[PDB]
C-alpha cells in the first residue's frame, strides 16, 4: 500500500477538510462509524491510501486536525462523520492566531507544532510505504496560513523525500474583508514556493463568482463555496483513490505536472457545475474559464501541463477524440516545447448525484493573474507600511515582508518567461 497522511489546519482547513472526508467516505462506502457497506469491490481496492483499517473491520481516516483554538474542531466532532476521526489526532491550543500569520508560524504555532509532529510521526510510522502529505488550509487566516506553512517545513525536514501536497484557499475581498489577508497570503506563498511539490489553488474569488454569476445564487454561503471545493477535491484525488494507470500516486502526478520545481501551482476545474451532459459538453466546459476554481483566464496564458479526469460510464473513444479536438483547435494555448503534455484518466465510478463528470487540473502560466491580484493588494498596504505592528511585534522585521513580496514577484515573471518561450 502507498499511504497518504492528511492534515487540516485552521478554521477553513478543518471545514473543507471535513467535507472532503464526508464526500470520499460516501464514495468508498464507509459510514460515520467507520464501517463499510458498499456495493463495489472497487471501493476497497485502494482504500488504504486514505484510511487505516482498525480491528472490527473499522476504517479510520489517516487524518490530523489542527488549530490554535478549540472551537472549530468541536463543530467537526459534532458534525456528521465527526466520530469517525481518531480522538488522539485532535490537536488544538487555546490562545489562537487571530488572523496573524506571525503568531501561527513563529509564536503560538511554534509552541504547538511539536505536539502535531508527534501525531504525524505516529501515523507515518504505521505506513507500509508512505507516499507523502496533503494539507488543507486557507492563506488568509493566521493559523492555517502561518502554522500550516510551518508544519510543511517541519514535516519536510523529517521526510525530505516524500511528496508535499496542499489545498490552498486564496483570499478574496468579495468573501472576506479581514484586510490583513493579503499579508498572510503573500507570506504563505513565499513558503509554498520553496517547500511544496504541488499546490491546488482554491480561489475564493473564483468560488464566489461561480456561485453568484453561474449558479445564480445571490448571497452565497461558505456551504456553497465548500460544496465546489469538496467536489473539486474529490475529483483531483480520484486517480489516487481508485484503480488506474495514469497519475495513480502523488509523485507520478508531480512528474507529469511540474516541469520546473517552483512552477507547481495548479488551476483546478470541474464540470458540470451544480439532463446529463455529453462528452463533448463535459470536455468544452472543463476547459472553460467559467469552470475554473482559480480566477484566471487560461486564454490569457499557455498550458505547460494538464491532467484531465472523466468519471462515469461513457465512451472512451469519444473522450479521446474530444481531448484531441480540444488541443488541436487550441494549439496556440499549449506550449510546443512540451510534447503530449495533456494526460487523460477515466474512472467508471461517478461522484454522488452525477451520472458523469470531468475534473480539470491545469498548470497554466495564466495563474500569474491570481498572484498579481494578491501582490497588488499586498503592495497597496506595504508601501504605506500599514498594519505591520501585528507582525513586527511578534519578532518579524520588514526584511521578511520584502523578500516574500519579491519572491512572489519572481514567480510571476518566471511564468511569463516560459509563457513567452518558443521552440525556434
Amino acid at each position: 500500500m502507498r499511504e497518504i497522511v492528511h492534515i487540516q489546519a485552521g478554521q477553513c482547513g478543518n471545514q473543507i477538510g471535513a467535507k472532503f472526508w464526508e464526500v470520499i467516505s460516501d464514495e468508498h462506502g464507509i459510514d460515520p462509524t467507520g464501517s463499510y457497506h458498499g456495493d463495489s469491490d472497487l471501493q476497497l481496492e485502494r482504500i488504504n491510501v486514505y484510511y487505516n483499517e482498525a480491528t472490527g473491520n473499522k476504517y479510520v481516516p489517516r487524518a490530523i486536525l489542527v488549530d490554535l483554538e478549540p472551537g472549530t474542531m468541536d463543530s467537526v466532532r459534532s458534525g456528521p462523520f465527526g466520530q469517525i476521526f481518531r480522538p488522539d489526532n485532535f490537536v488544538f491550543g487555546q490562545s489562537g492566531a487571530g488572523n496573524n500569520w506571525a503568531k501561527g508560524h513563529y509564536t503560538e504555532g511554534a509552541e504547538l507544532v511539536d505536539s502535531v509532529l508527534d501525531v504525524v510521526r505516529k501515523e507515518s510510522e504505521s505506513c507500509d510505504c508512505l507516499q507523502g502529505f496533503q494539507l488543507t488550509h486557507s492563506l488568509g487566516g493566521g493559523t492555517g496560513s502561518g502554522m500550516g506553512t510551518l508544519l510543511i517545513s517541519k514535516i519536510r525536514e523529517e521526510y525530505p523525500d516524500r511528496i508535499m501536497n496542499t489545498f490552498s484557499v486564496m483570499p478574496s475581498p468579495k468573501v472576506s474583508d479581514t484586510v490583513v489577508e493579503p499579508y498572510n497570503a503573500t507570506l504563505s506563498v513565499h513558503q509554498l514556493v520553496e517547500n511544496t511539490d504541488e499546490t491546488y489553488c482554491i480561489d475564493n474569488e473564483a468560488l464566489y463568482d461561480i456561485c453568484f454569476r453561474t449558479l445564480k445564487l445571490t448571497t452565497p454561503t461558505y456551504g456553497d463555496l465548500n460544496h465546489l471545493v469538496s467536489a473539486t477535491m474529490s475529483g483531483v484525488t480520484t486517480c489516487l483513490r481508485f484503480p488506474g494507470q495514469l497519475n495513480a500516486d502523488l509523485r507520478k502526478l508531480a512528474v507529469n505536472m511540474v516541469p520546473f520545481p517552483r512552477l507547481h501551482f495548479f488551476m483546478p476545474g470541474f464540470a458540470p457545475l451544480t439532463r446529463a451532459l455529453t462528452v463533448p459538453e463535459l470536455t468544452q466546459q472543463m476547459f472553460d474559464s467559467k469552470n475554473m476554481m482559480a480566477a484566471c483566464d487560461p486564454r490569457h496564458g499557455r498550458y505547460l501541463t494538464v491532467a484531465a479526469i472523466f468519471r462515469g460510464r461513457m465512451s472512451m473513444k469519444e473522450v479521446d477524440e474530444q481531448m484531441l479536438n480540444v488541443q488541436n483547435k487550441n494549439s496556440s494555448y499549449f506550449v510546443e516545447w512540451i510534447p503530449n503534455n495533456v494526460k487523460t484518466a477515466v474512472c467508471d465510478i461517478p461522484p454522488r448525484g452525477l451520472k458523469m463528470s470531468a475534473t480539470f487540473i491545469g498548470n497554466s502560466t495564466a495563474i500569474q493573474e491570481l498572484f498579481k491580484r494578491i501582490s497588488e493588494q499586498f503592495t497597496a498596504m506595504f508601501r504605506r507600511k500599514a498594519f505591520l505592528h501585528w507582525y513586527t511585534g511578534e519578532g518579524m522585521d520588514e526584511m521578511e515582508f520584502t523578500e516574500a513580496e519579491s519572491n512572489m514577484n519572481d514567480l510571476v515573471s518566471e511564468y511569463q518567461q516560459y509563457q513567452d518561450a518558443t521552440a525556434d
Partner: protein
C-alpha cells in the same frame, strides 16, 4: 540444452509476459497447473519446448522466467491469477515503491535496492540449464522501471554472464496510451545505456499496434489486453523456431546472423500477418501469397516507418502452419517484381525463410481469428531510424528548456548523462545513414 531465460521488467514487460506465457501454454498443451499430458518423459527432457520450460519430478512444466517490478500490484495479479500455479513464488519479484516514471529512480534510487535479489533469482534459473543460450528481456521504454531498471539489469548481466546473448522486446511509446510526459527522456536514456549490452532488440511501437487493433480488428478503443495479445502472437512467431522442431525449421540465431551486420545495427523491423477478426476470416482462406504480400504493407509493421523510403540489409520470413516452400518461393518472386524492395549493395538480396508446421493458436475470448497459416517478417531496414528521429525530436524540444530535468538531477543524475545519451542517439542515426550509402 539451449535454454532461454525470459526476464519481464515493469508493468508493460510483466503484462506482456502474462500474455506470452499463456499463449505458450496453449501452443504446447500445458495446463494452468503446469501439467502436460502429452509429455511422457517425467522430471525432464531434451524436447524443443524445454528451451522455455523446465520440469519438476511431479510433472510440472515451469517457465524459465523471472518477473520483476518496483511495485507489487501488477505482479500480484499474476500471484493470484489463473496461472498462479505455473510460477514458483521466487520467480515473481516485487518492491513497494515504483520508479514514478523516472529513469533515475529505476536505475539508481529504487533499483539498486532490489538488483542483487533479482540477479540471485536469475542465477538460480541459470543453474538449472545445461546449455544456456541467452536472455529475452521484455520492458517498456517510457516507464521508470522499464527504462531505468532494465538498463541496470542489462549492465549487470553483461558482467555476470559476459557476452552471452541478450535479446530485447522493447515497448516504444505512443500518445494514445502513454502515462508520462518524460517518456522521451526515459527512452533516450535507456537506449544509450543498453545499446552496448544488447545483441538484438525488437522494438514494438504501441501506436502501430494500437492502429492495427482499430483498423484490422475493429476495436474502437484498444486496451493493453488487446495490444498484448497481438504482441504475444508476434513474440510467439519469433520464438517458435526455438520451441518447436521441424524439417523446414530455421533457428532464430540463424536469422540473427543475417539481421545484425554490425553490433549497433541490431534493431529488426517486425511485420506480422494476417491480423483479422473471426467475422472476416470466415469463408476467407488467406493463402501464402496473400499473407506474404501483407508483410510489405507498412500498415502491418510493428514500428511506424517507411521501408519503401529506405534500404534493406536483410529480409527474413518466419512462417508457421500449413506452408510449403513451393508456394513461398512463388510468392516471393511476385513480390520482388511488384514491391519497392531496394537492398544495399554490400548484402545479398535473397529472403531467409523458415517454416514451423504447428499452426497459430489463439487465446479463448480473444480478438484474433484462428488461421491455418501466419507469417512474421523480420527485416533490417534503414527506415527503422525514423523511430529514433521522432523520439529524438521530442527529447530536444523539452531538453532545450531543461523541462522536468530537475526530477532526474534530484535523484543524483547529471545533465551530462542527458547530452551524452542524446549524442549517442545522434551517432546511431548517422550509423544508419552510412550503412545505406552505396559502396565507393
Amino acid at each position: 540444452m539451449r535454454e532461454c531465460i525470459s526476464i519481464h521488467v515493469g508493468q508493460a514487460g510483466v503484462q506482456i509476459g502474462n500474455a506470452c506465457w499463456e499463449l505458450y501454454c496453449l501452443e504446447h498443451g500445458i495446463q494452468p497447473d503446469g501439467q502436460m499430458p502429452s509429455d511422457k518423459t517425467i522430471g525432464g527432457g531434451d524436447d524443443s519446448f524445454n528451451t522455455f520450460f523446465s520440469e519438476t519430478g511431479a510433472g510440472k512444466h515451469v517457465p524459465r522466467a523471472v518477473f520483476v517490478d518496483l511495485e507489487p500490484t501488477v505482479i500480484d495479479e499474476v500471484r493470484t491469477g489463473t496461472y498462479r500455479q505455473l510460477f514458483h513464488p521466487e520467480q515473481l519479484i516485487t518492491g513497494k515503491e515504483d520508479a514514478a516514471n523516472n529513469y533515475a529512480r529505476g536505475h539508481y534510487t529504487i533499483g539498486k535496492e532490489i538488483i542483487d535479489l533479482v540477479l540471485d533469482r536469475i542465477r538460480k534459473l541459470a543453474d538449472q540449464c545445461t546449455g544456456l543460450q541467452g536472455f529475452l528481456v521484455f520492458h517498456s521504454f517510457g516507464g521508470g522501471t522499464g527504462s531505468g531498471f532494465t538498463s541496470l539489469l542489462m549492465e549487470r548481466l553483461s558482467v555476470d554472464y559476459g557476452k552471452k546473448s541478450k535479446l530485447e522486446f522493447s515497448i516504444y511509446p505512443a500518445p494514445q496510451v502513454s502515462t508520462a510526459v518524460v517518456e522521451p527522456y526515459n527512452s533516450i536514456l535507456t537506449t544509450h545505456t543498453t545499446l552496448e549490452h544488447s545483441d538484438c532488440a525488437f522494438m514494438v511501437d504501441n501506436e502501430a499496434i494500437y492502429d492495427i487493433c482499430r483498423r484490422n480488428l475493429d476495436i474502437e478503443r484498444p486496451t493493453y489486453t488487446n495490444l498484448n495479445r497481438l504482441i504475444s502472437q508476434i513474440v510467439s512467431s519469433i520464438t517458435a523456431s526455438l520451441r518447436f522442431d521441424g524439417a523446414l525449421n530455421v533457428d532464430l540465431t540463424e536469422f540473427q546472423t543475417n539481421l545484425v551486420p554490425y553490433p549497433r545495427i541490431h534493431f529488426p523491423l517486425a511485420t506480422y500477418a494476417p491480423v483479422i477478426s473471426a467475422e472476416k476470416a470466415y469463408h476467407e482462406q488467406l493463402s501464402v501469397a496473400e499473407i506474404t504480400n501483407a508483410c510489405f504493407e507498412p500498415a502491418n509493421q510493428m514500428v511506424k516507418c517507411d521501408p519503401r523510403h529506405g534500404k534493406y540489409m536483410a529480409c527474413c520470413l518466419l512462417y508457421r502452419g500449413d506452408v510449403v516452400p513451393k508456394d513461398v518461393n512463388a510468392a516471393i518472386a511476385t513480390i520482388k517484381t511488384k514491391r519497392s524492395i531496394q537492398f544495399v549493395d554490400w548484402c545479398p538480396t535473397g529472403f531467409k525463410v523458415g517454416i514451423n508446421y504447428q499452426p497459430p493458436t489463439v487465446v479463448p475470448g480473444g480478438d484474433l481469428a484462428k488461421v491455418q497459416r501466419a507469417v512474421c517478417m523480420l527485416s533490417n531496414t534503414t527506415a527503422i531510424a525514423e523511430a529514433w528521429a521522432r523520439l529524438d525530436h521530442k527529447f530536444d524540444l523539452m531538453y532545450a528548456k531543461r523541462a522536468f530535468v530537475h526530477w532526474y538531477v534530484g535523484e543524483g543524475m547529471e545533465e551530462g548523462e542527458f547530452s551524452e545519451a542524446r549524442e549517442d542517439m545522434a551517432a546511431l542515426e548517422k550509423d544508419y545513414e552510412e550503412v545505406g550509402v552505396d559502396s565507393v
